[PDB]
Design a protein around this ligand. Sequence first.
Ligand code: HEM
Ligand code: QDN
Ligand code: ZN
Ligand code: ZN
Length: 449
Amino acid sequence: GKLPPGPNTPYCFDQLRRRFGDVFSLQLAWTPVVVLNGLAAVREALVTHGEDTADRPPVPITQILGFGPRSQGVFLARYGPAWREQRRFSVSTLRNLGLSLEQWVTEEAACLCAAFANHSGRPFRPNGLLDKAVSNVIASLTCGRRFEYDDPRFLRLLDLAQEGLKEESGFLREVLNAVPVLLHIPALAGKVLRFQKAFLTQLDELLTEHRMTWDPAQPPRDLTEAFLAEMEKAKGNPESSFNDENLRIVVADLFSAGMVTTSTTLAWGLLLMILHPDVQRRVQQEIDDVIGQVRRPEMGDQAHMPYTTAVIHEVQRFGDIVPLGVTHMTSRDIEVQGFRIPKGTTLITNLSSVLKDEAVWEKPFRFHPEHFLDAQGHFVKPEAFLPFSAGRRACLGEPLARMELFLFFTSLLQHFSFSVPTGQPRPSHHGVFAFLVSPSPYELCAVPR
Ligand code: HEM
Ligand SMILES: C=C[C@H]1CN2CC[C@H]1C[C@@H]2[C@@H](O)c1ccnc2ccc(OC)cc12
Ligand SMILES: [Zn+2]
Ligand SMILES: [Zn+2]
């Protein structure tokens, strides 16, 4: 079996793809890595061989966060029953709460609009408030409450989360994962994940309060209550993943996976609306013709707003916030584009190469909403639209994220006209790579309509 050819990062991989093709390999430290580029490669790996590519590479430092065999959360959980039980529970719970989450999102959108209006037309960076609105949607899903935009514990929670994102990058974490033995030195153990650990600690305090107000004689109001109820039925069952050590991990996974993604996406959205005011006006025209100017947007509006739906999809395509997705690990030998992938290889899915594929999209490096329209103005979704990846491990947040993007974006453009402040440089459309790819900082003016 022949192996893939091969010898900041997103540009580098797209460079190597040019040189060695769509499936190439690397040795990143002591990890054999295979990178997949383009729709064909990614689907072959994640769908056709989806059974064998749905594992995660082990992360030894998660011991520090209370992880264990039946306590792996969902995002990093190894392929196996502790992942599948929590995967199915979150997917189902999200779905059940639809029957609601939309009500929580819609209320949050009105809170956000009111917070935007308080800037009375003066320039401001939108990011802070977008984070808060998006964080309160997760708060609503997980604990059945929101927090005020100036609640002290709410702000510390978001602060801890931002600092915890940074801890995903570093020399220290790379060494400790390589040799988990170094974790016996307390000086090192206490430093690796101090912000993520502090987040969980702050979270415990919220979960303890929620556990006091839970009414178990009523149907669960939110996901923590659904979990607690499952935890009751599972007392006496050492096989269950429904336990107090997993609860805090699963809820931390939903916050930390769901905040920065949806928020960054919305930040790209507003930036592209001030760089392309003509798209903005067309969206505001479609809003006026379908929704009007008083009534709050509802999810039922989306099927009648093909242009707004195109724009929101193009924001995700152009924004391309998670260029390299989330790593997978193979649990069996597989074949991709002919090449042999050994068991235990880390797979990197180059989602950027799918979203920006020049063979598929008309002008992939332009902001071009017609990427999702046909000449008639019908919304069409190409198969290369994979901002959430594919297969068994594809973003379980996707239905909620879709709801948030549509209800936050259209609520905002319903009530405000957005522009570049009249004395500043046209902000760049080029992102800042980090954990996520986010817009380079900008301010905007939001004036009522
Ligand atoms: C625009 C917003 C979002 C984007 C672009 C996004 C993107 C992604 C991607 C690329 C993955 C990796 C799939 C893979 O492993 O191949 C992922 C996984 C995941 N996402 Fe999202 N995400 C978004 C919002 C959310 C939200 C709102 C939540 C929670 C409600 C969420 C929760 C998760 C979880 C738990 C996983 C792990 C799934 C698993 O391992 O089974 N995400 N997301
Ligand atoms: C590729 C990164 C993924 C790994 N975790 C699950 C989803 C994302 C982010 C998150 C973690 O980095 C993280 C970031 C920020 N604050 C956190 C707070 C607690 C936490 O508990 C597991 C994990 C956190
Ligand atoms: Zn509750
Ligand atoms: Zn058509």
